Each structure stands twice: as structure tokens, then as C-alpha cells.
Write a protein that binds this ligand. Sequence first.
Ligand code: WVU
Ligand code: WVU
Ligand code: WVU
Ligand code: WVU
Ligand code: WVU
Ligand code: WVU
Lengths: 219, 219, 219, 219, 219, 219
Amino acid sequence: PIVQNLQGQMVHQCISPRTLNAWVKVVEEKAFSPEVIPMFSALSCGATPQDLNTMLNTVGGHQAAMQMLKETINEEAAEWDRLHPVHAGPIAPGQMREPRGSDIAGTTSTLQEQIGWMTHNPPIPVGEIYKRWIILGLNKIVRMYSPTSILDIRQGPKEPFRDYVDRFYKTLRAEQASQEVKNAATETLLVQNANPDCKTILKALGPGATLEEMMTACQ
Amino acid sequence: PIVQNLQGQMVHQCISPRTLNAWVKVVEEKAFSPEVIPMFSALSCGATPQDLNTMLNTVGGHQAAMQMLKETINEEAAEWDRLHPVHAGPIAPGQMREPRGSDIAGTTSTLQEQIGWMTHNPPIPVGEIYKRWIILGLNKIVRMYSPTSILDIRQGPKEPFRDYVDRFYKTLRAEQASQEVKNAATETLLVQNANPDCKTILKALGPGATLEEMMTACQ
Amino acid sequence: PIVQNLQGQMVHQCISPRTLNAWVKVVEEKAFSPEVIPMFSALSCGATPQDLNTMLNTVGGHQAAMQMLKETINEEAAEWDRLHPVHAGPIAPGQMREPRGSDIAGTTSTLQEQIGWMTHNPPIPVGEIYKRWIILGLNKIVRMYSPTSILDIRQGPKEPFRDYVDRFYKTLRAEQASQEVKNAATETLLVQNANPDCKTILKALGPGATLEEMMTACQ
Amino acid sequence: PIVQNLQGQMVHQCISPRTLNAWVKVVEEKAFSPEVIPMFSALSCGATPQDLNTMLNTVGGHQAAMQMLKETINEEAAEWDRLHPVHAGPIAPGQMREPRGSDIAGTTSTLQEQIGWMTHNPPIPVGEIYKRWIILGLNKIVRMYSPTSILDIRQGPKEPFRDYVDRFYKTLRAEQASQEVKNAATETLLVQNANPDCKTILKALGPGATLEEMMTACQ
Amino acid sequence: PIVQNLQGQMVHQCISPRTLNAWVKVVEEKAFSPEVIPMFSALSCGATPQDLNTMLNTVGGHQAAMQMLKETINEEAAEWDRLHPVHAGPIAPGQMREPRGSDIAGTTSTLQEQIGWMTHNPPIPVGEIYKRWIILGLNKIVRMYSPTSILDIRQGPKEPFRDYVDRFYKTLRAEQASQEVKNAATETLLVQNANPDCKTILKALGPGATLEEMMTACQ
Amino acid sequence: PIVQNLQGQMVHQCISPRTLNAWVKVVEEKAFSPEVIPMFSALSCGATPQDLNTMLNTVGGHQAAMQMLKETINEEAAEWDRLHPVHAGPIAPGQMREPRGSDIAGTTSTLQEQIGWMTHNPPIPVGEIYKRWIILGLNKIVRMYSPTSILDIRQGPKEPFRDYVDRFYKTLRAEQASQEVKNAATETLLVQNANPDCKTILKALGPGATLEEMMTACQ
Ligand SMILES: O=C1CN(C(=O)OCc2ccccc2)CCN1
Ligand SMILES: O=C1CN(C(=O)OCc2ccccc2)CCN1
Ligand SMILES: O=C1CN(C(=O)OCc2ccccc2)CCN1
Ligand SMILES: O=C1CN(C(=O)OCc2ccccc2)CCN1
Ligand SMILES: O=C1CN(C(=O)OCc2ccccc2)CCN1
Ligand SMILES: O=C1CN(C(=O)OCc2ccccc2)CCN1
């Protein structure tokens, strides 16, 4: 990653063993549960494209997902190249060349180049641009791997309402519902998919009930 | 988080893998036991709003609680916006814009903006303001999840008085009794809910007994 | 805690995840065995009152003990307020107010105030004063929780003398015997509570025997 | 490894216990699965040739592979010596001698020499040159140890298409297919090796389907 | 402990959680096996008397040994006081008082005093003096706890000579044989206590055989 | 160990708990497998003679080996004293005395002396000299403890050739074959000790086959 030293410089630092192991272990333990993605983002704080590639290449399983992710990266790289074409001439001696999409993805750029871009005044933030592409790809993977439609999350007859709500919102998160839909669902599908005893209570409450008020009402 | 370097500057530092894992693991192990909240506060020392969001987004389960927490945050953000409306014009070039409630919550502000606010002279402490909102929400969750009323904590016939007191005060803490009530309960409900043999001894002690004196009296 | 940086300043540093976890884990594993107290003292090196509260609030069990500890803290705070009353007027602008007992205990003081006191020239050592109150309370807890009187530690007929001595001194430590009594007990209760075969040997040794000499004599 | 200190110098630092243990443990757990190689590269960031030798020499098993790796290193060293012959005379006093292939591999060079080369202006990057040789050797080992031809990865009759794709791409990676072949295989061998029910669906899709589109189609 | 900072000063640093836990865990796992003592010495590098007391007070078991250790410390303190009596008058204002034996042992001295002594030019090395007393006491404990006389270590009829030698030298170490005796024992008790078949071979070797030569001879 | 600080000084630093535990644990887990030796060398990077003694003294088992190692150290110390005799007069006041072999081994030298030698301009590298003696001794131990002659490593009838090669080269390493012999053995004993089916294939290959080519040929 790129860090600041005591002279007030952003400098390169090697990726740590603790970071490397943390990422490998959360993929092994959680696969593509939605919470793996904010974990990835946080573990890759300050990452260069080289570091992001390291993290993704250290994953042993899930090679269908990794191939899909490469396809998404290649799509975003091709859109970058449409928006930001580069000169096809020799580099000005000593000077900084403009990144192509494959330079952002770290496949055609060196670490030294990446450091040069990221520590330019002002930064050409290749690590943050690449991370955005990766996260777009990982969100597609999370949705693909989501096992259950929200339509199929219904409260059991003896299931605590809290347990059902947990299953409902875990499914909405994996299915990639917007925050707008999550906030709105409280007055609609959440009640519909409730068991008859709870449904009666929630129907009786009237409109505008907070989730807290619905959860208190059904115990 | 924001830290001080050797030039006497508060600087940004990436959230550590140890911090990330510590938080995920205490939620997995303790859920919304009351002691998880001071743990959250301590693990989030110096946090930016981005860091606070990372910590909350890394939680995989408990999605009913996480949705309730988002509702509480949105309430406090709307109260901030009532108290501190911002100008709806273009930013003065190079200058610092005033935060709205969604900027404090990190959903409409960048990390660079958050750093600017938190390291202004004097600080606009967006991380501490947001943390206060989060803790308000988490305390509501702890009370919701508290399984047992204090009325239902009564000493068993062969239960050591110490074990009963432990159960009593654990329940009072989850039910969110004030320190005033915790301090006062020693002369009242604690004795009432004691077993007959202890109740006799504690009744005999007279008023003003310290909890230490009650615990010594009943063994 | 408060630490020294490279400009020779004592600065605030966040409590570490390793410190937080170490304390929670020693309470879970050892409860109020006497050795938990020097552990607390060492883990809280440099602590502010805020840090001390964090450590105590992160404890999930043992809520009878935690309530007793709050009572002891409130006693010592009331004695501080008797000895060191503060002015009941507006603060001199920009200047440092004198701490009350609840400021020392971190309930009515901010972190910034605590830093101001602890880094004043010369320090008003609020963290060390509060730690002294806490340790006084924890020692009361250790004595309360000590399961066995020294009178009841007697060597078994086939118990190795070393094993008995270990049980004797572990009990003396939890019962909070002074070092004077620990040093003196070697010539008296330790021998009396020995089994007949050892008692004969130790009686034969004469007075002034070191514990080493008694332990060698009985094997 | 070589790191930068606060005077802006790249300095030597000892290899850490965490790095040493991380490498030993990933070889013990993963052997020569393909993902062990990007792990090696990342754990050896900034390594001197001495550090690279340490890492390889700390491996206890897999001595057939380690002997093969020595053979590959000796081949690349002999090619370096063909391209970059050195003077066979006495060193200019105080001056830096040119590295031979065995100096790059750390067998005939001292640590001080390696530091001199790597911190020259501009660097003679002996650690990076040697790491390239090692990685070439490790990739040969990964291919040798790959257990299964791609021809033999075929979807079972009740095997989820995702599980099959995972097995297909894991095998392609170990067999060291180019990214070109991985990207192209989606329209050809992947479909051929699918079960009849999926094969029908994928045949029906038409050409140019993304892997995401094929995986969605077959569930 | 006392450490050097970047201004070239030895400064106080808090004892780490890793150090605290390392010591507690080696006593739990090894008790007073001889190798616990060099571990203690290394974990207490740079320790103040306060730190040494912390380490010893964090031990929960082994209270017979801890009482014996206090007795040894009190003996060495009384010898220090015989050799180095201090003035029984008021301290020169602002000036450094001379340590008594109980000041070296940290029972009558403050941390600030200990820092003053240890960072004086030249140091009054109270931590190293106290550590020497502690190690003298711990060596007495190791000998007391040694279970077996060297006379009773004899090679079994089917015991590999190496296994016997290991048992012999482990016992010599716990019994606190000098290095002179360890070096000499190879020509004498080691052979005598060997089984008849080995004894014959070692007798046949002649005098002056290295332990390596004896171990090779008997397999 | 000795490290460089920010003023560009090599300074003493305490041995870490992680280093101490790493060494104890690799001896417990691997005993004198050959890979323990490069581990020792790497864990002792920058070590003083005091640190090297700490590491060796922290080993609890294997006391036959530790006594053999002391004998080897004493041999190398006596050779140093033959080559580098020292003056038998009083030290020049304030000046640096020349090390004897027992000073290099840390038995007759203080830490301060060792620091003085190792940080002299130019260094008298006592830690590196002593480490060389220790490694010479440890290599003798590894050979002594090697359980099996290379003559006795022969491929089983159903043993994969790779598994056999692994056993062959693990044995050659413990028996301390030179790299020359390891490289040459591929054309000779490795083939001879192969099973008949592999032997036929390897015989058919002709001379000069790489180990990779032999391993591919036999599967
Ligand atoms: O075709 C490619 C090659 N890429 C690659 O191998 O990057 C590392 C990576 C990326 C995604 C998954 C696993 C590892 C970059 C993007 N596109
Ligand atoms: O609607 C919203 C969106 N928020 C959000 O997603 O923040 C992170 C978070 C917050 C609470 C729980 C889990 C994660 C911010 C507040 N309100
Ligand atoms: O009534 C009070 C409130 N206190 C409090 O809550 O402090 C933290 C704490 C203290 C003791 C035990 C558990 C946590 C401070 C002292 N007295
Ligand atoms: O013959 C050699 C000797 N080498 C060697 O021993 O290096 C360390 C190493 C290298 C590969 C595998 C295990 C350990 C360097 C290259 N060629
Ligand atoms: O009587 C005393 C009191 N001492 C003491 O308590 O020190 C800490 C310690 C020392 C030895 C064992 C356990 C803990 C110092 C020496 N003599
Ligand atoms: O006789 C000696 C004494 N030595 C010694 O005790 O050093 C530490 C050590 C060395 C080897 C094995 C275990 C511990 C130094 C060398 N010769």
C-alpha cells in the first residue's frame, strides 16, 4: 500500500502478512456473503493495483467467480480506454505516461509506475479506480451466489419474528436491494411474509411503524 | 482512524486487520450483550465515519438489528439537518463545505472531506458525532434483545446469593436501568426477589447496607 | 493511554485491541483470583480514566462485583470531594478546572480534560488516582470471593508437603494476609496444619527455619 | 528485506518471525497449489537474495520440488552469466563488483554485497532478478504437480454448474493455461464438458455469452 | 521497561500484553523446569523493579515457590543494606536519594525513582540488581523442584543411548551441576549408568572420547 | 539484537517475545530436522552472543544435543584463541579489549562489551562469529540425528516416483550431502534405487536428463 512517512511523504509499504492472511481466511470462512466486500475494501486500504492483484490471486478456490471478476475488470478497462485514450508515441524522457485500463488493473504497469501515479500532485488514483472495478465485480458475484429469493423468506409458525426479520434482511442484502427498498419493505413484503399471528398484530398497528415498533409488537 | 504523527499532525491511518477482526469476533461471540457497546466504542477510537461504516458493514448476521440501527441513524441525521441547515449553493473554491446529516453518517461525504472536518482548527468532530448516533442505536438494540424482565430474576432456593446478584445486575444492565436505580435497588427489589432464608437475613440487617454487606450476610 | 512521542511529549494513544482482549480474557479465565489484579494494573499502564472505564465496562459477567466496585469508587470519590472541594463558579476562559471525584472517575470529565490534567506541568495524575480507587475495590472483591479460610487448609495424609504449602499460600493471598503474616506463618499455622509425619519433622527442626528448609525436610 | 527509513534511505531489516511462519505454514497447508505462488511473491516483498534463500531453505518437505527449483535457478544463472560476463581481475578498492548468476542467487555473495547492489543509484535489483528465477521454477513445479488434465473435468449429472466451473478453472490455472485460453474456453471446452441438460441450455444461448450469463442460464 | 527513543534517550515504556501473557503461559506450561529461567531473563529485558514485580505477581499458582522467592529477595536486600547503608536524613531538594534493598526490590521506591536511578549518568542499575536476586531465588526453586537424582538416571536395557543421554543431561541441568561437571561426566557417571551393551562399547573406546563419539558408538 | 535507529545508529533492542516463542516452538515441533537450522539463522538475525545464548538456553529438551553443541563451541573457541591471542595486561582506561573465544560465546563478556564490539567502526562481528560456531555444531547434530542412510531409500513397488524422490532428497539433506552430490545423484543412485518399472523408463531416457524430465517420465 501507499502510506505517509515522517517527512510527510506517501511512501510504498509492503502488504503485511496479517493483511494477506486476513483476506484469505475471510474468503475461506464466508465465501461471497455480502459482508466479505466491505472487508475486502478495508483490508485493501491504500492498495496499489499490484496489491489488489495479490489479494485476488491469493484466493485458491472460487475460480468461477474469479474468472467472472476478470471479465468485469476487462469491461471496465475497455470503458476507461474509450473515455481516456492515451498517446501511441514514445514516452517523454523522465516523464509520467498516462495509464490505460490494463495499467490501472496492474497487468501492464510496474509498481514504480503505479507509485508515480498515486503520489503525483495531484494523485492519479489508480488503486482507487481499480478497486471500484473490483467491487463492481464482487457485487455481481454476491448477487449470483445469493441462494434464495426474498419471495421465499416467510416466517415459520413457531419462528420468533426477530429470527424471520434477520433472514429477510440477510436475503435482501445478498439480492442487492437498494436502501430505499430495505427502508420501504417494512410496510409491505415483511408483513406479507409474516406468519398469521404476527401478520394480524402488524396489520393492527397502522401505517408508519418503525421496524423497532414492529419487532416489539411481535415480541 | 485519525492519529498524530511526529510533526504533531493528526493524520489518517488505515483501520487495522486486528481491529477489523476484533469487532467481527465480538459480535459473533456476544451478539448484543451490553458489554459489546463499550467494546465498539473502544475499537472505534479515532474513527472516521468511513471507518464506523466499515465496522458496521463487516457484520454478517443480525440484519434486523442493522436495519433498526440505520433507522436510528436516519432519525438523528434528520435532527442534525433541522438544527444545522447548510447552504444550497456552489462550494467556495478550495474551501470546506458544512456537513449535512448524511455527510456525518459517511454516505454523502468522501474520506477526504471527513479528514478535512476532523483535522480543522478547531475540529468539526464528524466521527464522534456519528459514533454518538450509532451508540444511541446500539443501546436500543441491547434493550430490545434483553431476554428477561428484572421482575423475573428471583433467587432459587439453593442458589448462592452471589449467583443471584450476578443475574440481577446483568438483567438490569441489559434492561438499561440508570445508575441511580442500580444503586437504589439494593434496598428494595434485590431483597424482595431473594429466597426466604436470605430475605430474612437482609430484612434483619436494617437499612443502608452496602451490597458488600448484603453479600457477606448471605455468604 | 498517555505515551511520549519523539518531540518528548506525552500524547494520547488509543487503547489497543490486544490490551482490550487481554483484559476480557483474563477475567473470563481467572475471575477474581488475586493475580488478576496485578494483571489489571499492568494492562492499564498509562490509562486515562476513560480507558479504565472502558476496561471495566468491557467485562460481561460478574455484575455483582462490578456493582460493588462502583460503590467503592463512589466512597473514594466522596472522600476526595471532602479533601479537595472545587470552586462553584464559571471556568476562567481557556484555563484548567480542578477535578471533582466524578471527574477522576471519568463520569463527569471529557477525555480532553483528562489529557489536560495528566499532561499538566506538573501532572494532576487522575488516571493513577482513579486506578488506586479501582484496585482498592478489586481487592475487596478478591477477599469476598476467596472460597476458604486458612484454618481449613490442612495437609492430607498422603499429600506432598509442597502441594499443601501451595494451597496454604494461595489461600493466604486471596484472604489478603499481610506480607508480615505470610512471613511469620512459617513458624506457626503452616506447621500446625501439617500432617502428623511432617509436623514431627518440622517440630524437630527447631525455630527459625526458612520455608526452603521446611520444604526440604518434608521432601 | 530492504525498506526506507525516516532519512529517506532504503535500509536492511531482518525478516520477521510472522513472515517466516506465514511461508512455512502456507507450504504445509497448500503445497504447490497455484495460489501459493502469489503468496510467496507477496511475503518476499523487498527480499534480498539471502532472504529468498531463507524462505526456500525453511521448507522441510517437498524436497523433490526443491531440487527441481535449484536446477531451474542454475539454468537461469547460467543464462545471466552468458549475457553479463564479469571481469576476472581484483576488485577496485572500495568499489562495487558486478554480480554473477551465483551472486544473484545468494550463494557467492554476502549480505553486504546484496545491500550494496540493491541500494546503488540506480539499483542493481538482485533480489527482484532472483525472485523472477524462483517464480519461473515454482510455476514449473505447480504444473508438474497439477493432478488432472482439463480434458478430464466434466460436469456430473447432478453437479451444480457452478461447482463444475470451479473445478474447470482451478484445473486450468494449475495446468498454466494463458489468460487468452481461460477467456476463450467459455465458448468451447467449458460447454463441451458440461452435462447434457446444461449443454442444451448453453448451446441454445448463442455465441458471445459472458461466463456470468452461462452461469445464470444453468442456475 | 526502559528503552531508547529517537533523541537518544532511554525512556520508560509500558510492559506489553505479549510479554505479560508470554510469562504467565510459560509458568503454566513448564512450571520450574530449568529453561523457564533464561525465558524469564529474556522476557524481562530492560525491566524496572516495578516490571519485575508485575511479572512475578501475575503468577497464580506456585505460591510455595513465590514465598521462598520473597525470602531469597529479603536475604539479598539485607546484604545490600549491609554493604550500602543510606543516609537517614531529609532528601536534598530536587536530588536523587540512594536506594536501599527494598527500593531495589520495588517495594519502597516509586516508578519515577526507579527511572531516575536507571537513567542516571552513569546508571544505578536497580532493575539488573533486582533481576540478579530474583534469578538466584529461581535457581533455588528449580533445584528444589528437580524430581530425580542423577544417581537414579540409568539406561534401560532397550532404551536408545540418545534417549538416556537426554534424560541424564536434563537431570544434571535441574540439579544445577556446574558446566565443569557436565563436561567431565562424559568419562565417568554417564558410562557407569549406561546399560551393559553400551557400557562395553564405551569402555572399549578409551579415554577422551567426545560425547559425539560416544553417541555414535552406541548408535 | 543490534538494529539501526533514525539517527543512523545500530542500537540494541531486546529480543522479542515472538522471536523467543518462534524458536522454542520450532524445536518442539521439528527437533533437528535440517530446516530447523535456516530457521535458527533467520530468527537470530542481528543477534548478540547474549541473544544466541538465550535462544539456546530456552530449549528444554534435547539436552544430549545441547551438550554436544557446547563441546563444538568450546572447540571453535579454542581455535579462535590459537589464532587470536589477547594481551594479559590491564585494559587501557576507557578503551575496547580484544575478545577471547569465551567472550565471543558470551560466557565471559558483558552485553555492553558485545555492543561495543559489534558497533565498532569497523565491526568486530562477535555475534556473526559465534553464530557460525553454533551452526557448525547444529549441522553435526542434524547429521547425528538423521535416521536413515541414503542406501536404504528405495522406491516401493506401488510408491509414486514423486514420493520416493521426496524421501530420497529429504534423506540426502539430513545426511549432509554436498550440492554437487545432490545434483549428480540424479544420474546414479536415484535411478538405482527406483522400482523396476521406473528404473526401465529412466534407463531408456539416456544420460543428462533433468530431475523434471525424470519425474515427468515416471508420472
Ligand atoms: O484478464 C484479466 C487478468 N487480470 C488478473 O489476473 O488480475 C488478478 C485477478 C483478477 C481477478 C481475479 C483473480 C485475480 C486482471 C484483469 N483481467
Ligand atoms: O440508511 C442508511 C445507510 N447507512 C449505512 O448503510 O451505514 C452503514 C451501516 C449502518 C448501520 C448498519 C449497518 C451498516 C447509513 C445510515 N442510514
Ligand atoms: O456509579 C458509578 C458509575 N461508574 C462507572 O460506571 O464506571 C465504569 C465501571 C466502574 C465499575 C464497574 C464497571 C464499570 C463510575 C463509578 N461509580
Ligand atoms: O544449487 C543451487 C543451490 N541453491 C540453494 O541452495 O538456494 C536455496 C534454495 C534454493 C532452492 C530450493 C531450496 C533452497 C541456489 C541455487 N542453486
Ligand atoms: O517480602 C517481599 C515482598 N516482595 C514482593 O511481593 O515482590 C513481588 C513478588 C516477589 C516474589 C514473588 C511473588 C511476587 C518483594 C520482596 N520481598
Ligand atoms: O561450555 C559452554 C557453555 N556455553 C553455554 O552454556 O552457552 C549457551 C548454550 C550453548 C549451547 C547449548 C545450550 C546453551 C557456551 C559454550 N560452551
